[PDB]
Amino acid sequence: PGPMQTLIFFDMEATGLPFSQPKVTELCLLAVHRCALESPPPPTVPPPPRVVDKLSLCVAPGKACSPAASEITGLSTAVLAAHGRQCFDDNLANLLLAFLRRQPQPWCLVAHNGDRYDFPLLQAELAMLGLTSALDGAFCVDSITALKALERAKSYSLGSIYTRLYGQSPPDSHTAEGDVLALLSICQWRPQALLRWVDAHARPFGTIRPMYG
Amino acid sequence: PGPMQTLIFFDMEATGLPFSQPKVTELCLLAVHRCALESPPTTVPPPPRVVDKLSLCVAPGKACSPAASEITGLSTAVLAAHGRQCFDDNLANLLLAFLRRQPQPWCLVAHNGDRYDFPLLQAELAMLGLTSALDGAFCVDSITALKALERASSYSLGSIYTRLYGQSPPDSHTAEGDVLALLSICQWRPQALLRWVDAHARPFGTIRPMYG
DNA sequence: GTTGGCCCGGGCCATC
DNA sequence: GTTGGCCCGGCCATC
């Protein structure tokens, strides 16, 4: 496995915490080519690359959001149904894959605390559709682990890292797209160091076990 | 047809003006359920909380004209540096699957769409042999719409935006920036726009391709 | 850097 | 509203 050709920054919102077997309510993928981070007065926050692919979607979960999640995310099952949202079905999996197929391979998903939430949860959704092997060619990285390594070479939530790095809070927190753009900014802090950490720790996604599947 | 259930605001960037047989370099679709326009929430309007957004860069067959690169900040060598792929079958299936997530009838909204975004998109699909893919959708030129809304009450995207809101829109001359600025404008009188679009939603299949 | 509809033959303008 | 893991018995971190 060589250098990752595309970094796909990734975040989801869901009906609750892992023990509740949550269902996806919102997702965002932002695919960035390696050269945007290998060869990017100066601003405090790095400007996102001009050439990006972005996909943001709301998802009808099969059940009610927990009250705490509705409060944090601004999404509820009833409102999603009012906007006619469809559930996490086969067409959505085909959509995700068609988006990824626009990106040079190898792919590396990047998600904040991904190993405990975003990655198992996506794998659960795909597993329930029998598409457990649809992302087997992909790689993934947890940006909390990466940022710990980069910083040491204290809270590590997305908000705390952003503010510690950039001295201000990111806009539109606790949305899938807002948290993805914030994550992009954090990873653009020392982009070279991050690319070398990703290349050395890119984990096959097929080894991510479903959260509840 | 009845009430359009989904307005998909739409902009593309490309290599040049219509005379040069331009090729798409960037596109953005932003689908908004009509209920986000009929009963909005409680000075630019905030976008709806619930939206679907697709934004992509495309490798064109040819070079970008010098002015188009200046305006858009895209060039054909740079798109190749980012390993962008051409307008192909997969991309056509991408757009169709994204539209499948939206309730029908669909209506595309595009600024000066009757003369650029719509025929350019139709031409790309026609070179792929896919000239009937998006024909179940409707389309509406927001210049025609906004002219009538101010009539009963320059028409470039920037001039409209500054007239209603007073400041310049951010990220102008990108596909997403243009779409987001278009959304904000269409949220000025969302009630009257919905009635307008419903009264003048035109089948996408009545649009002839820009070339080929 | 254009030119095909829109305003009101022809000049203006809007997409990139 | 917190489980399950980590930074080095406490206390986060994704919703």
Numbering used by the authors:
A (entry chain B): 8 to 47, 53 to 165, 175 to 234
B (entry chain A): 8 to 49, 56 to 166, 176 to 234
Tell me, in the authors' exact words, what the paper reports.
TREX1 is a cytosolic DNA nuclease essential for regulation of cGAS-STING immune signaling. Human TREX1 is a 3′-to-5′ exonuclease composed of an N-terminal DNase catalytic domain (amino acids 1–242) and an unstructured C-terminus (amino acids 243–314) implicated in membrane targeting. Loss of TREX1 function results in accumulation of cytosolic DNA, inappropriate activation of cGAS-STING signaling, and severe autoimmunity. The overall structure of hTREX1 adopts the homodimeric conformation previously defined for mTREX1 with enzymatic active sites on opposite outer faces of the dimer.
To define how human-specific substitutions impact TREX1 DNA recognition, we next sought to determine the structure of human TREX1 in complex with dsDNA. Using the hyper-crystallizable hTREX1 variants Chi 4.1, Chi 5.1, and a previously described mutant K66R30, along with a panel of 4 DNA substrates (including 24-bp dsDNA, 23-nt L-form dsDNA, 22-nt Y-form dsDNA, 19-nt L-from dsDNA) from published mTREX1–DNA structures, we identified a diverse set of conditions that allowed the growth of hTREX1–DNA crystals. The hTREX1–DNA structure reveals a 2:2 complex of two molecules of TREX1 bound to two molecules of DNA with the 3′ end of each DNA threaded into the active site poised for degradation. hTREX1 makes extensive contact with both strands of DNA, including 10 residues that specifically recognize the 3′ end (D18, E20, A21, H124, D130, S176, Y177, L179, H195, D200) and 4 residues that contact the 5′ end DNA backbone (F26, R128, K160, and R164). Interestingly, R164 only occurs in human and primate TREX1 sequences, suggesting that hTREX1–DNA recognition is controlled by distinct contacts not shared with lower mammalian TREX1 homologs. Notably, mutation of K160 is directly linked to autoimmune disease, demonstrating that this substitution is likely critical for hTREX1 function. Two patient mutations R128H and K160R disrupt residues in the hTREX1–DNA structure that make contact the DNA phosphate backbone suggesting that these mutations cause disease by directly impairing DNA recognition. Compared to wildtype hTREX1, hTREX1 R128H exhibited impaired protein–DNA complex formation. Additionally, the structure of hTREX1–DNA complex reveals 14 residues that specifically coordinate substrate DNA including two human residues K160 and R164 that make direct contact with the DNA 5′ end. Mutations to K160 and this hTREX1 surface have been implicated in dsDNA unwinding explaining how DNA 5′ end contacts modulate DNA exonuclease activity.
